[PDB]
């Protein structure tokens, strides 16, 4: 996947993320649910949100949003030595949450969108680089385990 240099850039940028996980976790999820309204239907818990406003005005989402960048954070610090921590993840989104690989494709772009909005001007090309190749690795390894289980949908 990536080289040390790129792993550097990845955990450096994770730097920005750790300084405010609930605010970053919140804007990503709000990035997803408004950009792609159908992802919202997957959370019985949030299907009740109708506006952007009502979304920001929600502590539960802020909460959920911290569970996620905390679980990702975990896997990203492994530097691709995540089967351990990803295996458990692959089966729940596959079998119980039932989330399509494209929905994992969307949120990935939303990470990168989100970081440019919040850090416009110090999220450069090399960084953008290595963060994308790490979200791809993550995304491809899930694919791999989603294949294993026939989650064709």
As annotated, the binding site includes 64, 93
Closest to ligand HEM by CB, 89 vs 115, is: 89
Distance CA 120, CA 45 (A): 32
Residue 71, token pair as written in the block: 């679980």
Tell whether residue 77 is a contact of ligand HEM (CB under 6 A): no
Tell whether residue 45 is a contact of ligand HEM (CB under 6 A): yes
Tell whether residue 11 is a contact of ligand HEM (CB under 6 A): no
Residue nearest ligand HEM, Cβ-based: 92
Residues that bind ligand HEM (CB under 6 A): 39, 42-43, 45, 67-68, 71-72, 89, 92-93, 97, 99, 103-104, 107
């Amino acid at each position: 996947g990536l080289s040390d240099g790129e792993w550097q850039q990845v955990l450096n940028v994770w730097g920005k993320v750790e300084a405010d996980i609930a605010g970053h976790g919140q804007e990503v999820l709000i990035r997803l649910f408004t950009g792609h309204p159908e992802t919202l239907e997957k959370f019985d818990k949030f299907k009740h949100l109708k506006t952007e406003a009502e979304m920001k005005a929600s502590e539960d989402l802020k909460k959920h949003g911290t569970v996620v960048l905390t679980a990702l954070g975990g896997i990203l610090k492994k530097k691709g030595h995540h089967e351990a921590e990803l295996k458990p993840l692959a089966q729940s989104h596959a079998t119980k949450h039932k989330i399509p690989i494209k929905y994992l494709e969307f949120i990935s772009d939303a990470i990168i969108h989100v970081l440019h909005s919040k850090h416009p001007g110090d999220f450069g090309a090399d960084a953008q680089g290595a963060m994308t190749k790490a979200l791809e690795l993550f995304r491809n390894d899930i694919a791999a385990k989603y294949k294993e289980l026939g989650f064709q949908g």
